[PDB]
Design a protein around this ligand. Sequence first.
Ligand SMILES: *C(C)CC(=O)c1ccc2cc(OC)ccc2c1
Length: 247
Amino acid sequence: PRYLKGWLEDVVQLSLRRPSVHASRQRPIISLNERILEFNKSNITAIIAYYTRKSPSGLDVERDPIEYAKFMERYAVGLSIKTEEKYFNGSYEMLRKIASSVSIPILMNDFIVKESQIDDAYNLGADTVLLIVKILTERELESLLEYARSYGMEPLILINDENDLDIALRIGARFISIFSMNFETGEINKENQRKLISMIPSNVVKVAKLGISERNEIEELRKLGVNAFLISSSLMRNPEKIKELIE
Ligand SMILES: *C(C)CC(=O)c1ccc2cc(OC)ccc2c1
């Protein structure tokens, strides 16, 4: 990985030591990017629901992950499951249980820094993985994208700025999540997010992290060409709100 500081350095070093899982995948690869395009065609707002046991906002909500997943199976284009253990209190066992419980695409949301974590995702039933430009060398990012693709998974590449986009496009990214977030405050700079979106080629499937989890923000971004939306963990408090967000 890149050299990093603070808790991010800690979690990346912890992730390098993540024990691998020996398991047989229990389900097909259910492509997230393709389902997004299908929703676009059908004119259905495509929202990726996000589950994390512990939220960085400090407002943790008690929600049974299986109940949440089964509810979201009816509305969401896919699920993002935070599997990092130390700070977010996720687990591989939770991912496995969720994957065995629903038939919609599952994104393994973790700090992916080695090949065995992609093996883990595949073996556990995840349909794709997040790769984060800001924690990986370009060589690592390219190699991990290739490794995920070898499995039949199109990784979601997280970009935060123009530098990240330049690297992502060079290494062949076709499925990109646009944050443009101040890491220190957890706040999206909507102006910068929109500039980044405008720089992305038309043949890339685009997922925006919502800075404001409301229908107005979604409508504005969809007009700018965004294909799907990663919503806040706050939706765990009232899952039903996703009905409003989707129309
Ligand atoms: C969880 C797998 C992703 C997450 O929590 C996180 C934390 C910090 C961070 C910093 C970035 O740039 C400095 C990019 C992504 C990212 C993701």
